[PDB]
Design a protein around this ligand. Structure first.
Ligand code: HEM
Lengths: 498, 497, 498, 498
C-alpha cells in the first residue's frame, strides 16, 4: 500500500503467512507457557523469583545497548557487489583487480561524523563512506569520506578536533565557540572548511555524493615496483544538494531521511552506482611534488594525475537486521590484502592503530567472528586463540605456538611487504607552518563561481556569528589570508549579523 | 548572551590569575610535545614509541559507555529538600523526621523514547528521577511527568519499549508498531489520552509535575503501615507548547530543555516543586472500586486529599555532565527504613530490573561513583572484590557472616513490615480489567471543548500513518471510551486519508 | 608410547599429514608473509606502527583471559549421551523420558568448589557434577554435586560460606580459622562436614564418584498431578577413594590428575557410566515428613523412598577444544523443560536467579549463542533482539514486540506451570534449628564402622588443629552434640595435636 | 599466639575492640535488618523478589572475579620506599635520582610467569620483580625479572612462547613436548634455559633473589647527552635456593609459601632490602660492542661495565587488602619520567604497546584512577575525558580540546625526548641466525663449577625426559653446540631415564 520503508511488517507477514507461527521459547529453547502475566501470590501479591521467563526477558532487555561509535554513530548500511571493468594489474597484484568481470561482494556504511545515534540526517557535516570488500585473500576495508581531504594533518589532534566538534563537557551543548576556536587555531582546516560550507556540504541523500579514500595508498605489482595511488568512487546518479531551509525542514520532519531514501531506492529496484577510479603517482613525481604528496589537506590535480577507471560499485541489498549488519559492522583500514599497502601518510598510520582498539572496546575481543565482519571467502588459520564470547571451534586441537614441527599453519613468503629506505632523524617534526592557502585559493577562484561563493560566505557567516569577537577576528584573518574577497565578504556579513 | 555559551569565558575568568598547568599523561609524566607525532625523518612512518599518542588514542577510543536502554537523553541538576510539615505519623524515615531538615538531592530529567542525539521538544512522557542523600543511605524516587503508565504488567515493558523504538530492520520509527501495541493493549488508553493532550509537550523541565505513580508503603515507629502516593507539583506554573512551536524548537535547538534548565539555574531563577502525599489506609485498599495497586489508576483528590510534606529546590548545575548526569544511577530498590514497596507488579519488576542494567551500563562497582555514593551513610557490609574496586575493599575486615571478630552486624530495627496474603501462586490474567471509566471521567470533566478538539487532532495526526485495520481497532477503543471521542477521531482520520 | 593425553599433537599431525599446511592469515584473513621478525627501521632501529600483524596478534594475546567462575573454577569436561531404560511417564511428561531407548546428547563438567584454575585435583573438597541435556524442548541443566546434601540451607549465606572457604582478604592465604569459625557458627553443616571428611571426601578420579541433584524437584505428568523427586546418578565403575598421603603425593606429582584420568579413560574406550535414578515423594508424604522435605541438609531414606531406575549416562567424547567446550559452558538450573519444575527449596530458588547473572558477567549477554550452550535440538523464537556480539541473524525482520498481528511467535498453554495454594505470612523466617543432629547421628552410627569413624576423626582433627582454641571448643561442642564418642575422639586427637 | 599470617583476624579484632561494630548496610547505605534468612511466603513457600538485600549480595558475589593476568597471575605484593645513596645526576636528570637522601614511595609485586592463580609458589619458573616508583614527575614502572636475560629476542614470538609454556589447548595439561619443541626450534633460549635450570631457578622466597630490568635503558642528563644503562637490584639478604625435593615438599604442603614468607618477614620487622645499581654504556661502546647491545639474550660483563651503586629498596609495609593493592595494580613500562627513555630494544618497544592494552582489558579503561595506580605525588592535567567508571571530577569544566585560548593545560618544552639519527631500510630483519652460544659457554665454564653443572644437567634431563625422541635429539644438538660436556652429560642422563 505504502512505500517499502513502512510496509516492512506487512511484507514479513505476507512472506510468512502460509507457515504456522513458531512456538515461544526462552533463551535456552524452553517453551513459554504464558508471556502476558507474571506469577504472583494470589490476585494482589508480591512477585515470585520463580518467574524465570520474566527474569530472562528483563535481563536481556537491560543489556540491549552496546557502546556507540565515538565518531560516525548515526548511519545507514547496504550490501552489493564490485565489478572490475578495466585492467589495472600493472599497478597492483591484488586479487580484487586480477581480471575483468570478477564480481566481489561488498558492504557499505554511510554516516555523519558529529551526529549521534538520535540525530537528523540532513545536517551540515562531512559524510562517511566506508566500503568493505570480501575477497579470497581476506577482507579489505576502504574507509573513506565524501571529501578528498580532511580538517587536520597530524594524528594527535584528531581527539581534540572531535571534542571541539562535539558537545560542551559541562553544558552538554553543541558549541560553535569551540568549533571556531579550534578551526582558527589550526588554519590548515581552511580547505575542508570551504568544502563543507560550500553547497556540497549537505547532500540530498547518500546516493548523490562521491566517495574518497583521501589517503595516498601504495600499489605493489608482481615485479615489486611500487606506486602511490588515490581512490575515488564517483556517483553515477548525479550530484544533488539541498538548501539550508530545506535541510532544516527535512530535519524537523524526518531525522532518518537518508536511511529511508536509501532503503526505498534499493527496495524499488533503483540500485545506486559508483564508478571506481584511481590516481597513480610514481616515486619520482612524489619527490618532485610541490607539496607533501602524503598530506591529507592536499589533493592531486586532474591535469597531471588523470583519473583511470577501475570498476563499479552497485548496492542492491538492504540489511536484513539493522543491528546485526550495520551496528555490528567494523571497518579496519589495516585490513589490506597483498598488493595494497599503506604510505607514510601520518593520519593513515594513526588510523592503522586506532580502529581495532575501539572495535575490541565496543564489539568485543572476538568481533571478527560476527558474520558481517567474517572473511567468509577465506579461512582464518593462525595461532590466535581463546577469547571472550568465542563461538568457534577455536581451531580445534591445533598447536597454539609458532614455530612448530607438527604441520601447523605456515607463513607465505609472497606476502612480504615493500621496503623503502628511510633516512633522517627519529623525532617530532613541527608541520603547522606548512603551505595551507594555495589550493584553497585555487578552489575558491577557479572551481567556484559568484553565486556559490556568495552561498559559501553566507553559510560560514551564519555558523560563525555565534562565536566570540576575537575568535571571529582570527577566522576572518585566516579567510583574508585565503583571499581578500573571502575575508571582506565574511566580515561584512558578520558586521550586519552583529 | 546565555551563560551556557559563555561557559569557557566563565571558566577562564574563574582563574584569571593562575598560569596553565603542565600537560601530563595518564600516569602523570609531563608531555614534551602534543602537536606532532614521532616519525623517522620528515616523511617517514610512525614509531610505536609515541606513548603519548598511543595513550590519548586509546582513551579516546573508549570514551563512549552504553546509553540507557530508556531515558537516554537527559538533563541533570543538584539541590536540596526541605521539610515543611510533620508527617511522622505515616512514616518513621529520617527524611521527614523533623521540620527544617535540609537534605541534598540530585534530579535527572529525560524523555522515554528519545535517544542521545534527539530533540527535547517531542511528544513523549518525561522522566523525573530524584535521588535523596540521607543518613539512612540513598533514596531514589524515580517518577514520571504522568501519574499513570501505559501498561500494568511488568513482562510487557520490553515489548512496549520495542514498539515505541525503531523498526528492527529499517531502523525507522513505526506508528504502525506503536498503534498496533496500543490497540492490542487497551489499558494504555488513559496514558495515551494524557500524552496526546496539551501537557504532552511541556515548555521546559521547570513547567511540569512529577509523580511516583506507584503506591508506596509508609511504616511508622509502631509498625502500622499505610499506602501512599507521591506528587511533586511545580511552583513555576504549568506551561505547554503547540505542535508547530515544538517542531520549530526541535529544528532550531534539540537541547532546549537542557539549555533552559542551565540558564534558569545560573541566573538565580531556581525552580521549585512542592512535595505532597496521598495516604490510603489498609481498609480503603480493600474497599477501592478498582485495584489500588494498578499503575493505570489514580486516586481522586476528593477521597484522598493532598497533604504537603516538603519542597524541592534546584540551585546547582552539574560541574561535568558525564560525571554527574550520565554516570548517575537511580535504583527504586534503594528505600530507607520507613518506606517500603507495595504489591504493585510494575514496581516489583523495577526493583529487579534497575540494578541489573546499572551493573551492565556502568560496572559492578557503580555505587563507588561519587554521584552515586551515599556520602551521608557509613557503608559497612561483606560485599567484596569487583571490577574497578575503588575505595578500600573494606580493608582487612572479615568477609563472611556470621563471625566472632566484631564485623558489621545487622540491626533488628530495619525489619520490614509483615503482611499476610492468601491465594494460589500462579499467573493471573489481568488484561480484561476496568480500563474505561477513569479515562471517560478525565475526558468529559477534566477537559473542555478546545482541549478535546486538540487531543483528537493530535491523536489523528499521529495515527493517520498506521494501517487501516489498526486505525479501526484504535477507533473502536476510543469509541468504547466515548462515542464522541471515537466519532471525532474517525472523522479526522477520514479527512486525513 | 605414552598416554593419549601426551600424544595429542602427534595424533593431530598424523591426522593432518595428508593435507597441505594452511597459510598463515591475520584476523581478517589477510595472508601473513613473515611472523618471525618485527618491522624495524634499519637493523638497530625503533619499531614501527606498520606491523599490523604484530599489533593484532599481541592485542588478541592481551585479551584471552575471561573471568574464572566464582566457584568451581577448576574443571574437566566430556560429552556423551543419555539413554532411557525404564518407564517413568507416570511421574513426568518431559520428552526426555517420553520413550524407552530414546538417546539424548549430554555434556558434563566435573569440578571442585574451592579450587582455583591452577590448583590440584586431589584435594579434600566437594566435587561438582553438572550435566546438560540437549532436548527438543530446549536444554536441561542438572547441576549436581558428589554429595546428596550441602553445608547450609538458606541462600543468603552462600557468599559468606564461599568467602570463608576461600582466601583471607588481606593475607591471600587459606584460613582454617575462618573455615571452622563459619562451620561452628552454622551447626547445620555438620552432616556435610561428616560426609566431606569421611573416606569419600577425596575420590579417585571423576569416574569413581556418584552425583546428586541434592534438590527436591517437581515432576508434572500430563494430568497435572505433581510429585516431588530426587535425582541420583550412581557410578557403574565402583566407588574408589584415595588416602591423605596418596592424595598429597598425587597433588605434588600432577595437579591435573582428574583431567588426565578422564581424558585417558575416554580415549582408551573405557567409557564411564552412571545409572540414573529418582526418589519420588507425594504431597501427603511431604506434608507428613519428620523434617522439612525441602531442606538441603536432609536426605530421604531408601527404605521409605526406594530408588527407581530411569536411565544411563555414558561419556564417550573428549572436548575438541577445552576453552571452547569446557571453559565457555554454562549450566543454568532455571533451564527446566516442561514436566520438570522447581520446588520451594530456598537454595534452588536462589540458584535460579544467581546462575544467569554470573553467566552474563563471565561470558556475556549473548552467551546462549555459544555452540556448547546452544539448544541445537530446539528452534528458538522469542522477542529478544539485541546484545553485545549478536551472532545469529537476530531473527531477521520479525516483530520485536508482543502481542502483535503479524504472525510473530506465539506462546503455547501446554507449558503452563503447576499452581499450589501457599498460606502464611510474607516475612523472613529463622530456620537455624531444624533438627540438625538426628540424620548425622544416624549416618555416623549405622553407615560408618569403627575404622571409618577413626579415619573421619583423624581427618577432622588434622584440619581443625590450626584453628583457635575457642573455635576448636565450639566445634568440639557441636561434635559432642552429634555424639559423645565423636566429641571425645575429636577432642583427644586435638589435645594430642596441640 | 601464632604468626601474623594466621593471627590476621585476631589482630584485626583486637585493633577494634574499643569501638561499636558498624551497622550492616546495603550497597546504597540502607541498613539491613536480617541478613540470615530470605523473605518467603509462609514457612515453606517460594522466594519473592522483595529481597533487595539478597539480590544485591548475590549479584555482587556473581561478579567478584576479574580476568587474571595473561602472565604472572600468581603474585605477592608489598609497599616501601626508595632512598638515594650516591650521585648519578651526570647520567640522568630524573627527579628520582635528583639528589641524595630523597625518599620515594614504591610498590613491588613478585610473581611467577607460567603459574596460574591457584598454583604453588615453589616451582621452577622465572620470577617476576615489578617495581613502581611514585615520583613528582608521575609514576615510573621498572618491570623486571629475576634473570638478566630472556628466552627470546623478538616481540612477535612472546605469545607463542607463553602458549608453549602453558597448558595444551585440547587436553588442558602441561606439555614438556611443546615446551622443548619451542626451546629447540629457538636456540637463542639456551642462555635463559641454563639460568633457569641452574640452582637459582627455584629461589627460597622473594627475599632471596635479585632483580634485573634486563633492558638497556637510555639516560638523558640536563645537557641532552644520552647514555645506555642497565638496572640491577641485588638482595642484601643473600642468595638462597632450594633443592628439587624440598621445592616439591613445600609445594605439596603450602602453595603460598612465598606470600606467607614475605608477609611474616615484613610483619616481624625483618624488612627485606635490595641495593640499586646501574651499568652505563656510551654510544661508542654500543657501536663497538661484539654483540648487539640491545639484545635481550646478552648481558654486559662486569669487567668492562662495572656496577655503580645508586640507591636502596626497602619493603616495610604489607598490603591491607590483597585485591585492592596487589590484584588491581598495573605496571606500565611506558610510564617513564623525563631523564629515562627507551632504547631500540625490540622487546621493550613491544612491551610499551602490549602492557596498557591488557591493563585496559583486565581493569577497565580508567584503571589509572585506582588508588594503587594513581600518581598521588604528581598533579595530573590533560585532555583525556569521559570513560567507563569515571571515578574523578572528569577535570570539571575545563576545555577538552587542544590547542585553545582559555588557559587549559599546556605542554612543557623541557620534557622533549632525545633525537638519534637512524638510517636503514624499513623492513623485517631476521634475528635467528645471530650469536647465541659464546655467552652461554662462558657462563657454563667459568661461573658454574662441577657440582653445579651436574645439578643443571640432572634438572634439564629430568624435565626433558618426557619429550619426544626427535625433540630430545634437537635439544641435545643445541646443548652439544654449547659444549660437548653439556651435550654428552645430558644425553647420558636421557639414555638412563629412557
Ligand atoms: C516493569 C516496569 C519498568 C521497567 C522494567 C523499567 C526499566 C528501566 C530501565 C532498564 C531503566 C534504565 C536505567 C538506567 O539505564 O540507568 C529505566 C529508567 C527510568 N525509568 Fe523505568 N522501567 C519501568 C517502569 C517505569 C515507571 C513505572 C516509571 C515512572 C513512574 C519509570 C521511570 C523511569 C525513569 C525516570 C528512568 C530514568 C532513570 C535515569 O534518569 O537514570 N520507569 N527504567
Amino acid at each position: 500500500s505504502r512505500d517499502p520503508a513502512s510496509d516492512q511488517m506487512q511484507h514479513w507477514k505476507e512472506q510468512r503467512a502460509a507457515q504456522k507461527a513458531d512456538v515461544l521459547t526462552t533463551g535456552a529453547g524452553n517453551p513459554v507457557g504464558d508471556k502476558l502475566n507474571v506469577i504472583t501470590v494470589g490476585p494482589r501479591g508480591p512477585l515470585l523469583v520463580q518467574d524465570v521467563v520474566f527474569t530472562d526477558e528483563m535481563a536481556h532487555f537491560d543489556r540491549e545497548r552496546i557502546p556507540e561509535r565515538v565518531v560516525h554513530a548515526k548511519g545507514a548500511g547496504a550490501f552489493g557487489y564490485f565489478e572490475v571493468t578495466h585492467d589495472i594489474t600493472k599497478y597492483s597484484k591484488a586479487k580484487v583487480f586480477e581480471h575483468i568481470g570478477k564480481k566481489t561482494p561488498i558492504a557499505v556504511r554511510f554516516s555523519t561524523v558529529a551526529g549521534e545515534s538520535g540525530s537528523a540526517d540532513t545536517v551540515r557535516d562531512p559524510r562517511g563512506f566506508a566500503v568493505k570488500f570480501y575477497t579470497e585473500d581476506g577482507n579489505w576495508d576502504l574507509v573513506g569520506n565524501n571529501t578528498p581531504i580532511f580538517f587536520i594533518r597530524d594524528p594527535i589532534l584528531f581527539p581534540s578536533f572531535i571534542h571541539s566538534q562535539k558537545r560542551n563537557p559541562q553544558t552538554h551543548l553543541k558549541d560553535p565557540d569551540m568549533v571556531w576556536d579550534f578551526w582558527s587555531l589550526r588554519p590548515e582546516s581552511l580547505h575542508q572548511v570551504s568544502f563543507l560550507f560550500s553547497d556540497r556540504g549537505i547532500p540530498d541523500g547518500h546516493r548523490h555524493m562521491n566517495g574518497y579514500g583521501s589517503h595516498t595508498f601504495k600499489l605493489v605489482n608482481a615485479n615489486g615496483e611500487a606506486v602511490y595511488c588515490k581512490f575515488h568512487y564517483k556517483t553515477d546518479q548525479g550530484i544533488k544538494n539541498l538548501s539550508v531551509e530545506d535541510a532544516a525542514r527535512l530535519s524537523q520532519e524526518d531525522p532518518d531521511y537518508g536511511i529511508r531514501d536509501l532503503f526505498n531506492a534499493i527496495a524499488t529496484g533503483k540500485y545506486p552506482s559508483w564508478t571506481f577510479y584511481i590516481q597513480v603517482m610514481t616515486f619520482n613525481q612524489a619527490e618532485t611534488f610541490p607539496f607533501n604528496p602524503f598530506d591529507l589537506t592536499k589533493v592531486w590535480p586532474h591535469k597531471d594525475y588523470p583519473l583511470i577507471p577501475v570498476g563499479k560499485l552497485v548496492l542492491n541489498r538492504n540489511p536484513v537486521n539493522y543491528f546485526a549488519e550495520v551496528e555490528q559492522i567494523a571497518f579496519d583500514p589495516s585490513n589490506m590484502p597483498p598488493g595494497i599497502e599503506a604510505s607514510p601518510d601520518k593520519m593513515l598510520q594513526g588510523r592503522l592503530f586506532a580502529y581495532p582498539d575501539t572495535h575490541r572496546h565496543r564489539l568485543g575481543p572476538n568481533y571478527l567472528h560476527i558474520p558481517v565482519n567474517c572473511p567468509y571467502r577465506a579461512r582464518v588459520a593462525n595461532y590466535q586463540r581463546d577469547g571472550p564470547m568465542c563461538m568457534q571451534d577455536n581451531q580445534g586441537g591445533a598447536p597454539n605456538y609458532y614455530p612448530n614441527s607438527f604441520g601447523a599453519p605456515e607463513q607465505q613468503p609472497s606476502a612480504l611487504e615493500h621496503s623503502i629506505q628511510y633516512s633522517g632523524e627519529v623525532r617530532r617534526f613541527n608541520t603547522a607552518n606548512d603551505d595551507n592557502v594555495t589550493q584553497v585559493r585555487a578552489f575558491y577562484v577557479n572551481v567556484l563561481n559568484e553565486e556559490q561563493r556568495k552561498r559559501l560566505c553566507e553559510n560560514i557567516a551564519g555558523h560563525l556569528k555565534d562565536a566570540q569577537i576575537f575568535i571571529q577576528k582570527k577566522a576572518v584573518k585566516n579567510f583574508t589570508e585565503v583571499h581578500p574577497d573571502y575575508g571582506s565578504h565574511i566580515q561584512a556579513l558578520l558586521d550586519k549579523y552583529n
